[PDB]
Amino acid sequence: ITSRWLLRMLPWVETKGGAYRVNRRLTFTVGDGRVEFVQDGSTVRVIPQELGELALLRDFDDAEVLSAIADRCVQRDFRAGETLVERGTAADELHLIAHGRIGQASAVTLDVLADGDRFGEHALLDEDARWSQTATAETSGTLLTLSRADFAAVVANSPALRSHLAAFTAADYELKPREYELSVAQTILRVHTRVADLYNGPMNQTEEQLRLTIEALRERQEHELINNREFGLLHNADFKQRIQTHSGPPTPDDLDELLCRRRGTKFFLAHPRTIAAMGREFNARGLYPDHTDLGGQQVPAWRGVPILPCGKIPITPERTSSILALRTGEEDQGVIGLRQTGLPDEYEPGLSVRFMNIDEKAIISYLVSTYYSAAILVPDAVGVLENVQIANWPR
Amino acid sequence: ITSRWLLRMLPWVETKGGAYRVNRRLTFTVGDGRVEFVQDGSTVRVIPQELGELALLRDFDDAEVLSAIADRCVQRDFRAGETLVERGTAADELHLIAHGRIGQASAVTLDVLADGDRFGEHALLDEDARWSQTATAETSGTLLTLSRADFAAVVANSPALRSHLAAFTAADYELKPREYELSVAQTILRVHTRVADLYNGPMNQTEEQLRLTIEALRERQEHELINNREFGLLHNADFKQRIQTHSGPPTPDDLDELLCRRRGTKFFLAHPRTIAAMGREFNARGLYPDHTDLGGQQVPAWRGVPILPCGKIPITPERTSSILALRTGEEDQGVIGLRQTGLPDEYEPGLSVRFMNIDEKAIISYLVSTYYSAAILVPDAVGVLENVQIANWPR
């Protein structure tokens, strides 16, 4: 029953056969100290060529072997404040950081590793390796793990790798298409036969129940478009596009930085609590931003970019939310809504209601279905500002 | 997916109420040493008047008693090489041969009994009777059995029979209509709702699955028309029309004999292996038969009668098949296809596809049904050449 801004702002394109294909270019250079990954929503995997940045694997350029080694790592997720390794415990895993920041405290907090960093190199070769620093995850993120035993097995598999390891001991174009499959929001509406036979003259309680069902389906559509793992702007956004606040509250400097990272930003999406926090920051700074009109409707904006409320963005127990800056379009590579119309029996252009059966208890069943998905044409189309403290007040 | 010659050659007539009636005349004369039977597909029963050929029942002409005695016999089937009775074992059954040939070897192979023969007469009267010959079934067939105890019970039932038996101890017209009931080929097609909602623009996978279902139904129709027991040309063919090969391979003399037994033969039906064997025999004899055109299609023929391949004719493990010679028509008494059109919801003139229900798992069910049967107006419309050796090669 709430306002659905993402549904009415994202353009909808018609897929054929319930599938879509997006061609991805992944530019990456070796030697720069950062490992680049391939991300498919929430599932991530290291680029096989990038894997060569590791010294113990430098100058090895057999595509088969690198691909196998890349395939044998395991993805793990860590929450804020969770301890991953502890000082004193023997080291047996190589950790490649894909997202988040992790502060390492030695026996003296050395520094904080971030996206593209590695720790655990020496643990791979010798069995005497011991963790001398404690890594505490300051921010939630992902991390790839390469076990010593698996790499040893791969070494015992390829003779070329043995010889290269024994000898050492003494812009790249990568095309890989991404396939999007239409997800379904489905439900069963059970209407008693009496309610369909009698209550049908001045208003249809069947039609009113169907409208309520459609509204619930649309709310689920928005919640999935925001929070789903395979597709979904919160999770299926490039790791480089996700920024951290300088101080924690959503100061206007953070909004300027969020607008810096991409061209032609269309709008901001944030929780209403987050919008209140941004307004508090604006009042503290003493500036009054203008409001712009979209569709004959006035809306708060920053630098002319409208800020739209979305209640489906989660609020963490620590009262920290996130802000999304995103451009929409097909001619300009942005975010599109994949949706198939022309269904066999449409109550609405995107909907399909079909009579299922009548039970022995005289209850008619209807199947209400809609098919939807989201596509991001280029990586630099959605930026996310994370860990935004929304419970800060002037003191 | 194979060619269906029987479906496209048999004329189809429309039955009313799903039933058909065929009037049968069964001419039979007494005293000629052969017992005539009434055959309804695979179920056979002795004519009550013919039962009088037995000496111990000669001159008894009470219709009630003869009908009762005829009703109290049991039909049994025997395969090739199976031993039915053994020398030394006491005789307690009267056996009337309805089909097949059985060679009797005494203590010296006496002869071979055939259709209409009887053995076990004396076993009926006295209890001292003992089998002095071993009957080995050279060919598969049927056989009626009259037990001594049942006949004794019938004797103890009718006073007239007692007096006639005590005294002895010191062209007929029979009309009996045959009723044909339409059989059904039915199936359930389960199509997922997603496959019906999305995959429907450039080609319908629902329609393609329906076409595959229809093809499977047609294949089952042919297999039943050939091999079914109630109706079906292989089994519902007159015992006099079934011939045995003189040598075992399908020599052209056998085809001439098969064409001799009936007037206006329409075509031959045989397995493709059988057609290859016939071609081998033709090449061995040195004659090259002509080919005739039906429906603008050239086809091998013998004496101008086309020979059509049918893969539904079974091949026995001994590599022996059968050939069918049959005439089709309604104005000329032959073989007709009973089929009812004008169904409530027809995808095809003979078909009926109806939506059944949608399951809780969002699977749509369709019921695909067709109604069919076969009728043989006169006994001399289908002839069968049996035990045709199809694995014979020149040496």
Added chain:
Amino acid sequence: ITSRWLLRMLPWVETKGGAYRVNRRLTFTVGDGRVEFVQDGSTVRVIPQELGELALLRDFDDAEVLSAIADRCVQRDFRAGETLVERGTAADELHLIAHGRIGQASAVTLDVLADGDRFGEHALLDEDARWSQTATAETSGTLLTLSRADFAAVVANSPALRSHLAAFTAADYELKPREYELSVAQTILRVHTRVADLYNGPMNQTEEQLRLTIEALRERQEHELINNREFGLLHNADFKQRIQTHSGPPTPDDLDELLCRRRGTKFFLAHPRTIAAMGREFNARGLYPDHTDLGGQQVPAWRGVPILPCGKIPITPERTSSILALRTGEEDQGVIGLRQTGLPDEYEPGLSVRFMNIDEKAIISYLVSTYYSAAILVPDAVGVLENVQIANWPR
């Protein structure tokens, strides 16, 4: 300059994007003593489920493990008369026969293994295994090999396989699409500038050279359609459809058998020497087959099926050829010719001639290109009669 029957008889269909897709159903049942394979032209691979017919692998039904084991076998080809294994040599390989016949002579010729047979079971488990029979390949064919070491490695990889092996020691539907890529026949025509400037009034020697080039390209097209390994009727034909002659000369019984295996055969393709041998056999048998008219052209035929000469079918040094029986069509699943028209610069509907450059020596270069391929919709569309002795004369 010769007659090109295959070019003018095969229907040509237009592919989109230079690629075609054929959906294959591979029905196979386990326990019947024959292993079924998947064939892609000349490359063959064992079905993973069929691999379970081996006792030492019976009841193991892990799809991953079976797929891995199937992937780790090696395909080998053997010619007629070549010895593969010898008596006395230690056994270290499991051999699965995919095509051809191999006679095994023990210390006494035991028998002849054929397609779907296996020999070398016990060699897999123990290292004491020794070949006690000599296998001589009577006919050319293929053979899959499974080494003992590879299977042992797979066992050491999967814990489930170890447990199943330790315990033992104490119709299936498989869909897999086939992709056809258009092959190219290309050439460069070098015409001197003087020949293009002067010899152009009454006849164009440039155009005459182009016609000769086109004829050579068409001859190469036919030779590839017949003899190519990836596609090509001689090699890309089902192993079950390939038959062996009963005696060696192409007797009419062999032609009858070749017509038996498939429905609606369109024509025969054979070398003119093979056609002469068939005519000699016909004269010896004393039968004179009729001739039929296609396209207003009379042609020899057998059972009404025209026999077309093709000089591109190889003749072996032993003077043995092969005969092809094949049906053509798209509505009836047969053999189609994949070809793309509408090229950017067409001299002919299927051709493309493009000016390349003019050399410093004043020689104009032209690029003449054509794109073609062959598709076989169903396995039972091409049958091959092999090892046909064509040098047999009456004596």
